[PDB]
Design an enzyme around this catalytic site. Sequence first.
Site, PDB file in Angstrom:
ATOM      1  N   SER A  43      30.953  -1.884 -11.131  1.00  0.00           N
ATOM      2  CA  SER A  43      30.524  -0.727 -12.015  1.00  0.00           C
ATOM      3  C   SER A  43      31.187  -0.494 -13.130  1.00  0.00           C
ATOM      4  O   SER A  43      30.600   0.111 -14.003  1.00  0.00           O
ATOM      5  CB  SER A  43      30.673   0.463 -10.907  1.00  0.00           C
ATOM      6  OG  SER A  43      31.822   0.984 -11.060  1.00  0.00           O
ATOM      7  N   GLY A  70      30.014  -1.340  -6.830  1.00  0.00           N
ATOM      8  CA  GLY A  70      30.307  -1.940  -5.364  1.00  0.00           C
ATOM      9  C   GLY A  70      30.593  -3.306  -5.197  1.00  0.00           C
ATOM     10  O   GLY A  70      31.150  -3.856  -4.262  1.00  0.00           O
ATOM     11  N   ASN A 100      36.812  -4.702  -6.313  1.00  0.00           N
ATOM     12  CA  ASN A 100      36.315  -4.127  -4.936  1.00  0.00           C
ATOM     13  C   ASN A 100      36.631  -5.121  -3.835  1.00  0.00           C
ATOM     14  O   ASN A 100      35.817  -4.932  -2.627  1.00  0.00           O
ATOM     15  CB  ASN A 100      34.747  -3.832  -5.206  1.00  0.00           C
ATOM     16  CG  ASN A 100      34.489  -2.939  -6.141  1.00  0.00           C
ATOM     17  OD1 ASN A 100      35.258  -2.144  -6.216  1.00  0.00           O
ATOM     18  ND2 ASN A 100      33.563  -3.208  -6.837  1.00  0.00           N
ATOM     19  N   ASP A 188      38.522   9.319 -11.819  1.00  0.00           N
ATOM     20  CA  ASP A 188      38.653   9.230 -10.529  1.00  0.00           C
ATOM     21  C   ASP A 188      39.825   8.079 -10.187  1.00  0.00           C
ATOM     22  O   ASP A 188      40.022   7.675  -9.033  1.00  0.00           O
ATOM     23  CB  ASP A 188      37.460   8.890  -9.551  1.00  0.00           C
ATOM     24  CG  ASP A 188      36.851   7.618  -9.927  1.00  0.00           C
ATOM     25  OD1 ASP A 188      37.162   6.870 -10.852  1.00  0.00           O
ATOM     26  OD2 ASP A 188      35.814   7.034  -9.272  1.00  0.00           O
ATOM     27  N   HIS A 191      37.372   4.259 -12.216  1.00  0.00           N
ATOM     28  CA  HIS A 191      36.407   4.156 -13.082  1.00  0.00           C
ATOM     29  C   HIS A 191      36.707   4.874 -14.485  1.00  0.00           C
ATOM     30  O   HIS A 191      37.476   5.792 -14.496  1.00  0.00           O
ATOM     31  CB  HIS A 191      34.908   4.806 -12.558  1.00  0.00           C
ATOM     32  CG  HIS A 191      34.735   4.044 -11.307  1.00  0.00           C
ATOM     33  ND1 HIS A 191      34.856   4.634  -9.983  1.00  0.00           N
ATOM     34  CD2 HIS A 191      34.211   2.773 -10.971  1.00  0.00           C
ATOM     35  CE1 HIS A 191      34.459   3.717  -9.147  1.00  0.00           C
ATOM     36  NE2 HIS A 191      34.100   2.811  -9.794  1.00  0.00           N
TER      37      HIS A 191
END
EC number: 3.1.1.47
Lengths: 212, 212
Positions: A43, A70, A100, A188, A191
């Site tokens: 992402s 993801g 990830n 967050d 990101h």
Amino acid sequence: ENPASKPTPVQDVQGDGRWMSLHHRFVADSKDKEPEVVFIGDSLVQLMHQCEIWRELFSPLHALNFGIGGDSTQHVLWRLENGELEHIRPKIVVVWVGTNNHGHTAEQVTGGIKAIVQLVNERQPQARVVVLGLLPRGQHPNPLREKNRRVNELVRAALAGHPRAHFLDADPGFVHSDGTISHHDMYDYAHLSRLGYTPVCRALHSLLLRLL
Amino acid sequence: ENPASKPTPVQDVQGDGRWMSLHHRFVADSKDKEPEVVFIGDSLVQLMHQCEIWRELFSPLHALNFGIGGDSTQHVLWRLENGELEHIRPKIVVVWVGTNNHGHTAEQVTGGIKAIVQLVNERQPQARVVVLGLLPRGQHPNPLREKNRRVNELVRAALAGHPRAHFLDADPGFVHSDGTISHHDMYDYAHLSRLGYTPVCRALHSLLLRLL
């Protein structure tokens, strides 16, 4: 097998089939377009297309963005093997994936990244490959910081002997002296915001322009 | 118990603790700020803050955004009970959550949404509550479309008898006649692009201004 370098689609356990719709769109992009640069990964790739200005820096370069939120390495590998490198002849492929890969050791993720560079070298032997270092994450010091750092050492030492494979660390220093990541950079703590994208993307744009 | 209305944090199975960092930030926001509107829910809430212009429409309204990507109803419930409604006295609370409740029936998600309206009515009895309908998702017709539609019927009929609880369907008609959702609206057939946010947010802004 390294699970990180065993190609596999993301299995739909939700029901709306959106991962496979994304993949089919990118396949149709590749059938119908003639990019010079293709971007693939998770992402951090995908959101650059909206969330940063891709238009000003990357659109001129004739660039497709094949980021999927993801994705792990094995997901990207599968996508590159199952249609997204067909019908094109990019000059450069940019790879950004590995953060990830939860439940894989750093060595395994590195093995995933090395398998993607290998696939690209075989299916698109003319292209240069750029691999981006995995960014830090988490507000404070934590084991994914150290994991992603280790991935980055191992990947850089693997690509050091590759004439047309380039490791780029695009991290400006998101981890501060007090050990913290700012939510202005990463809303967050993983990101990037518009602000966190700017320096990343200009490091990327500069490498791309030398190469190109 | 309905698992959708049993308050519970998201358990960290990755290691960087980012969900709990987000929650603590919002708690500190509430301690230190005096919003009139608080927005809470999942990444459709969260990404509006960057990805749409929140500054032009919502910043004037004295608004906190407490969206967390991936949250289900029970996650929001927990967050509202564990500090994010403390030290404030909003006029309006906006709720947008339920599309991630995978493995819950529509009735259960509705039960989750009703428990959030109930918590807010008890902890912040002066506030109006706005609940946004769950948006369609998936490129083509699929069972989450029908799930989220059913949630929306059940929630609307539950809020019909509530003087200061308002159901808003902000969907402009993202599902087209051919059954498809456009990636111009929803880049991954679930999350909105800047374009998909515009009409959603102006439906929301209009409701907020009448109320306010």
